[PDB]
Symmetry: C3
């Protein structure tokens, strides 16, 4: 007996959908769900999705509340849909996937991933749920995560972090490090060797290596000299150039963080979704330097140093492809006279 | 001559409704009220209520702008409606009560509380307004607040704090401590002896006793040893246990505050209203420990210590009823071998 | 080939409208513009204006992204409309002007400012755009800004600060100081000698003279004695009086800033637009002192001292007119026995 009122009962009494019986009275108005508590309406859910309000409400209530892959990972791996769960996209306040399997009668294309409608879709499977490894083995297209080994299957070690109710974290009381597996057209695919982005934010930025501690603490010329970085244009790429009307460089999140602790600046997130490379319309409050499309990636600084130091500096311009978060990211590399001029994720 | 345009005149010129004559031009669109200032529309009010936009606008403009009881107190006392004022619920951005008396022609059930429609309703009366004590004496059901004594009536001393335009505060330039009185079916009721919650928030938390100062400053084992608290499971109840996937304990706001000053965590307020006991879906950003329904109460720590120390520890499980904010709050008490295992507000 | 889809293409790929060819798929629902990125809808724009959603979207995308006069300056100068650009009002999330010239086919009253419909309107011209000085010379009503001199025209030096994508700043990598010129009925008008407000905010307040540094650092009686301010009621006007239920004085932003660094307070911005004088419904969290209409101006403290010290203190009450941001601001001056009682922007 699935219903709007029953979903609301679960939210009010359990914090989310938990399969409990019961009903509470509900009002729908203005894309918002309310319920009566002692004779006044209390807001339970504001629909920010493109789905109907009561449908979105049910999907949100049925969201996965265990650590799950960040949406950008699932996207980069080509995931279309999840088996018997909802991956809630907290950056968009919306379901990560349009359709569902065994979740909601308005969005379900199937009750079970073994139905033939699911065959051409890349289904996400969670080895922590009973039977789902087996369902991946029988699926034509899919992505599987597990905490441990699956007999015969060659694993890919995923990122250290995962998302728990919209909080991205490296778990200590829970496990957030998964093995990853993928199948295309019935055939297991070798996932590529890859870097992972670090999913940090500007206000709460915290370093994760001695080099990153050195970066935030040392002045620019000291850091560059210590890590033998002359000729790699870190003054431009990482620290940023605020001297001209067009803001120069500034493509590593750690660089933004250092600048932010001194003087604030405005980041307009004009495509607000989770992705490996983010684009911001940036305006520096101190100088007035700005840039309409500033591509930013949060790599561990050691990894960015490793990447840029392995490049051939004898070419004037080169497209460098780097595998990050399981996807190929193109960088523009500009050199002159054997040193880097600039190096940025290509637009 | 009451009107939308006149209400808007008062808001623009006086900050709220003040009974002044005048009109300004108004536009209504998208549940929002606008007015023209020099030929551009300026937003005056966004309707977040379940009432029609212009009705909600008028009630908000007519909100009481003196210190008033917090909504949770009025709710716990059974208040249905206020006499000739609007108690605005700043936690819901909505009127605390569905109907009104002598306020608004769309929501009024009566012009005066003496009309017979009001008799079965518990009417809130404010002794600071002329004639309202007398109206309480003649009302069949009601709650009265005063700053001083009412001849013959046995008072109940209320909380130290009250709400002034949505700010909860202990007044120094104004009085926020009221006497409380209540009548049911024409008969004055003795209000019970009660604790009061402290209405503090996580970011702005400030202690209010030497014990609370000691709690935030001392380490756990020092605080417990100083206040002779061994065997009362404060390590679980108050400090919180973040070692397992399910977050243990953590039911006193002061405990959350201590944890917050060290590492942040996410509180999902999934029933956003004022109440004596709040329920949060909590996720700890550092460990990944979480809990779907974490009941939290902001008692003075001395009061919580007094409560828990008066309990009988010879039973395995017991429902303990405590009067807080004039309402009976049920606690689950779990003991083993003469010590507390856990003690939480019952769900 | 102007279109909704083309505007969205520019936003997605360039951060704003940039005249590039291309289309992306778009969805409109709930006053919001979305676009598909890999098969999920992503929000590009939430319409907060009184215009239709797709019209507002286009105006916002075509906003001027160079430093521009703050909206309050343009308003005070009587600007009705801009020539071939959009001044976006970041305080209202809406176009500063109702109509446009050569911007958008839904809001255009003309393609060029020389069309006769524009003659009775005060058109804003930007000397940094080719041909616009000449268009001002031929316009019947207008306001012109330039970075340098215009032959024959007597300039007015404007404020040091301007707005860049909603950030108000004194430019170091860009120029934000303009000359101002104005024409009424075909005749250049002498702009008056004027003070300028400083456009600072409460949380990020930073002093801009030795006197202002002294104000934030020194105690009240020391500051008053140092700058020979006895008898000018700074204890009331600038520092604020929180002892009675009605909050006294507190009309200089710098005074609010000092108070805020010690104990927080609530400012209800009940007419949320840019203006030289702002009105707030203020509630002091510490004392409960409040005031429905508290007029606040952010003058440099030196300027406020210069203003108040030039006043005649032999009258009981006087309306003092001061030119600020090119507009006449009326102050009420109350004196008794040769000293200031109060001095505030008149309501």
């Amino acid at each position: 007996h699935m219903s709007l009122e029953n979903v609301a009962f679960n939210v009010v009494n359990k914090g989310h959908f938990d399969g409990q019986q019961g009903e509470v009275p509900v009002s729908i108005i203005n894309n918002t769900v309310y319920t009566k508590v002692d004779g006044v309406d209390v807001e339970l859910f504001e629909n920010k999705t493109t789905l109907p309000v009561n449908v979105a409400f049910e999907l949100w209530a049925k969201r996965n509340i265990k650590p799950v892959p960040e949406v950008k990972i699932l996207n980069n791996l080509g995931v279309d849909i999840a088996a018997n769960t909802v991956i809630w996209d907290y950056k968009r306040d919306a379901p990560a996937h349009i359709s569902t399997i065994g979740v909601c009668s308005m969005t379900d294309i199937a009750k079970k991933p073994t139905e033939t409608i699911c065959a051409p879709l890349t289904v996400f499977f969670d080895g922590r749920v009973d039977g789902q490894v087996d369902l991946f083995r029988n699926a034509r297209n899919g992505v599987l995560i597990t905490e441990g080994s699956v007999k015969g299957l060659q694993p890919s070690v995923g990122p250290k972090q995962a998302s728990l109710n919209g909080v991205t974290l490296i778990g200590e009381a829970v496990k957030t490090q998964f093995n990853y597996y993928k199948k295309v057209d019935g055939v297991v695919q070798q996932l590529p060797e890859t870097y992972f982005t670090q999913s940090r934010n500007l206000q709460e930025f915290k370093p994760r290596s001695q080099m990153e501690i050195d970066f935030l603490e040392l002045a620019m010329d000291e850091f560059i000299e210590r890590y033998k970085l002359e000729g790699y244009a870190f003054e431009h790429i990482v620290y940023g150039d605020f001297s001209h009307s067009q803001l120069g460089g500034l493509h590593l999140l750690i660089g933004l963080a250092k600048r932010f602790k001194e003087s604030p600046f405005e980041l307009e997130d004009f495509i607000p979704m989770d992705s490996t490379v983010k684009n911001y319309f940036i305006t520096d409050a101190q100088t007035g330097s700005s840039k309409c499309v500033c591509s930013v990636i949060d790599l561990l600084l050691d990894d960015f140093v490793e990447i840029i130091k392995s490049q051939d500096l004898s070419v004037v311009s080169k497209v460098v492809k780097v595998t990050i978060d399981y996807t190929e990211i193109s960088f523009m590399l500009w050199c002159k006279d054997g040193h880097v001029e600039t190096f940025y994720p290509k637009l």
